[PDB]
């Protein structure tokens, strides 16, 4: 009966497993113990360094001092104080190499990668004070690298001088902001407010202004990092029960100055056939030969520069300057990377409209941020992607069809909650300015009410055989790999598989939508919270399905 015990409960220490992860730090393609990576970073110019005991000299590797710290800092510091000490010391390193334009900064990318293993190591263990300071020190490093702060849009001809140094460290540092604020998100819903400091939020407002660079070609690894940072802020918002305090800190100017460039994002195009192509900028998400790889969470796809991250440190010689990471020695077999990039930028557009629908939830009442300009742009998104899917993303047989479906249905949720309750911002300006989008967002789900489309088992299976072949091969990958009772079934599981897949590819077809969604576009018209259409216009759409 009773639960049993153990003679020799051998628990590895939290900091024990910490040094595990830390010493064997590795980033995809950075083939190494990234601590060793660091061990391949000597800096001649700076022969004097010491913050919390950080001896460094001419042929004295950054990593030699990194291992120095890691080791004796284990017995000195605790879990979170170890974190903080790494953050601040290696941050002083971040700085004094960043403000040392004469040297090259191969340090900061993997230093920041170390910062990430730190950051990730636990949410609860990691402390918001340390996390606070890490972002502030990253902002100081960006100020020290004022020359190479952003990516100004032909001195750049396949030459990875600072492109594989400062710019690579920029992507790394941006992914660091992202994961920093993600572990802040994971910190419990009670103790954010100390993080909520307008120092933090102003510094971020600036870094966002530098990332979503509307006027200079914004590196898409960086774009992803910044939009994810915004998602993390909005999520910690939804979380801190005393959300009034955090919302007081976040200025309405902050809201606007961010969400407007989020509009300029959500309305830059997703075009696989040219994703990795630096052509029509301010629309096609380039991240092509110029610069593509992971960073610190991103599985950007191939991680082309990934193995080059290892190729950044000689891993065969002591290097004062980075080993060349070639910019277009890069990859390319078949655009499944472009397909997954479409899905990736589609999850980026999802994050955008997600925090949009999420602020529409919390700010349900009157809000200077629920202004209905939200209505305009978000409903534009809804109708626009609806059109793209039913017109071009049909037959295209991609996995990204599913994600565009997610986009449209979630912006439907957003504008619908806007419709149902939050007209107190709305006026006839926005009504007629975007009446077409809303009303047809409505009809698109209305006309689905036929239910005579499938009605059976011989047709939608073939429809998916036609277009949904991709996600069909993925449901087969599911039946084969990714779940458990796909063997000797109770005669309900496979049936559920086939109903779900059939309604799924229908949902790719903008037909046979979830009947909840059909109603949740019917009610905006028929429920008179706003009577969009007069009696001389409502029947004009009613005819298009019968009625």
């Amino acid at each position: 009966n009773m639960v049993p015990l153990n003679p020799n409960r051998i628990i590895p220490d939290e900091t024990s497993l910490f040094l595990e992860s830390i010493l064997l730090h590795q980033i995809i393609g950075a083939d190494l113990s990234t601590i060793e990576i660091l061990n391949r970073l000597k800096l001649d110019y700076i022969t004097e360094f010491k913050f919390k005991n950080f001896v460094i000299a001419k042929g004295a590797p950054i990593g030699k001092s990194i291992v120095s710290l890691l080791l004796r800092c284990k017995k000195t510091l605790t879990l979170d104080r170890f974190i903080d000490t790494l953050l601040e010391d290696i941050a002083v390193l971040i700085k004094e190499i960043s403000v040392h334009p004469n040297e090259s900064k191969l340090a900061v990318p993997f230093l920041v990668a170390l910062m990430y293993q730190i950051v990730q190591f636990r949410p609860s263990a990691t402390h918001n004070l340390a996390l606070k300071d890490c972002f502030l020190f990253i902002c100081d490093l960006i100020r020290i690298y004022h020359h190479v702060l952003k990516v100004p849009i032909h001195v750049e001809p396949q030459i990875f001088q600072y492109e594989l140094i400062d710019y690579l460290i920029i992507s790394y540092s941006f992914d660091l902001l992202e994961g920093i604020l993600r572990v802040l998100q994971s910190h419990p819903k009670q103790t954010y407010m100390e993080f909520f400091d307008e120092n933090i939020l102003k510094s971020f407002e600036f870094v966002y202004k530098l990332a979503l660079t509307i006027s200079y070609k914004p590196m898409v690894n960086v774009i992803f990092s910044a939009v994810e940072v915004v998602n993390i802020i909005t999520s910690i918002i939804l979380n801190m029960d005393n959300s009034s305090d955090l919302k007081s800190l976040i200025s309405g100017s902050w809201w606007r100055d961010c969400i407007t460039r989020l509009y300029a994002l959500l309305e830059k195009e997703i075009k696989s056939g040219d994703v990795y192509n630096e052509n029509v900028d301010t629309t096609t998400l380039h991240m092509s030969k110029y610069h593509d790889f992971f960073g610190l969470i991103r599985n950007i796809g191939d991680n082309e520069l990934g193995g080059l991250i290892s190729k950044l440190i000689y891993t065969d010689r002591l290097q004062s300057v980075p080993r060349v990471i070639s910019k277009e020695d890069i990859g390319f077999t078949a655009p499944i990377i472009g397909y997954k990039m479409e899905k990736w930028l589609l999850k980026l557009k999802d994050e955008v409209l997600n925090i949009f629908e999420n602020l529409l939830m919390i700010y349900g009442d009157d809000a200077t941020i629920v202004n209905g300009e939200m209505l305009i742009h978000s409903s534009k998104f809804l109708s626009r992607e609806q059109a793209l899917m039913i017109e071009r993303y049909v037959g295209q047989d991609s996995p990204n069809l599913d994600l565009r479906c997610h986009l449209i249905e979630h912006t439907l949720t957003i504008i619908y909650r806007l419709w149902k309750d939050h007209f107190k911002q709305l006026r006839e300006e926005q009504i007629k300015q975007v009446e077409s989008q809303l009303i047809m967002s409505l009809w698109r789900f209305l006309v689905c009410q036929t239910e005579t489309v499938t009605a059976n088992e011989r047709e939608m299976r073939d429809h998916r055989h036609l277009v949904d072949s991709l996600h069909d091969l993925t449901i087969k990958d599911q039946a084969s790999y990714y779940e458990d009772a796909f063997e000797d079934l109770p005669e309900y599981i496979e049936e559920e598989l086939k109903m779900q897949l059939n309604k799924r590819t229908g949902r790719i077809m903008q037909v046979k939508y979830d009947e909840k969604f059909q109603e949740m576009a019917r009610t905006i018209l028929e429920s008179k919270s706003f009577d969009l259409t007069t009696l001389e216009e409502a029947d004009s759409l009613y005819i298009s399905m019968g009625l």
Binding site: Y363, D365, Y416, Y492, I493, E496, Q500, K516
Partner: protein, 135 residues
């Protein structure tokens, strides 16, 4: 038995009293209070058909979750916790809990999307606090 026809007539009456009454709430009460048994538990088929008919039901009834079930909240969470405890009756079955969580994502999530802060907060408090409760 007596419930195979219950699910069949449930979907039949869902078709019948659809739209151009509302005793659908008594049926939702019955189909919340009519699954905590082991009498035919090994017949996952009938339970699946009845609970998935309930899935399509509340899919046709997000508004039922904005009726504010007397408890300091709406119908959404007094739905989903009874959901959860029927699941912990039937914990192991992988695809059962798979479609079962998907059904909650088509019911409780639909309620939050239909409403605003109120429904969202009601769901958040209970599940974040039950995460903390179990840990």
């Amino acid at each position: 038995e007596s419930h195979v026809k219950y699910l069949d007539e449930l979907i039949l009456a869902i078709k019948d009293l659809n739209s151009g009454s509302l005793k659908i709430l008594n049926t939702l009460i019955r189909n919340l209070k009519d699954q905590r048994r082991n009498n035919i538990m090994k017949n996952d088929t009938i339970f699946s058909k009845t609970v998935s008919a309930l899935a399509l039901l509340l899919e046709y009834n997000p508004f039922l979750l904005v009726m504010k079930d007397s408890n300091g909240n709406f119908e959404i969470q007094r739905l989903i916790d009874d959901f959860l405890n029927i699941s912990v009756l039937n914990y192991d079955n992988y695809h059962r809990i798979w479609f079962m969580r998907r059904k909650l994502g088509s019911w409780c999530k639909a309620c939050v999307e239909f409403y605003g802060k109120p429904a969202k907060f009601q769901l958040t408090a209970h599940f974040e606090n039950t995460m903390n409760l179990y840990e």
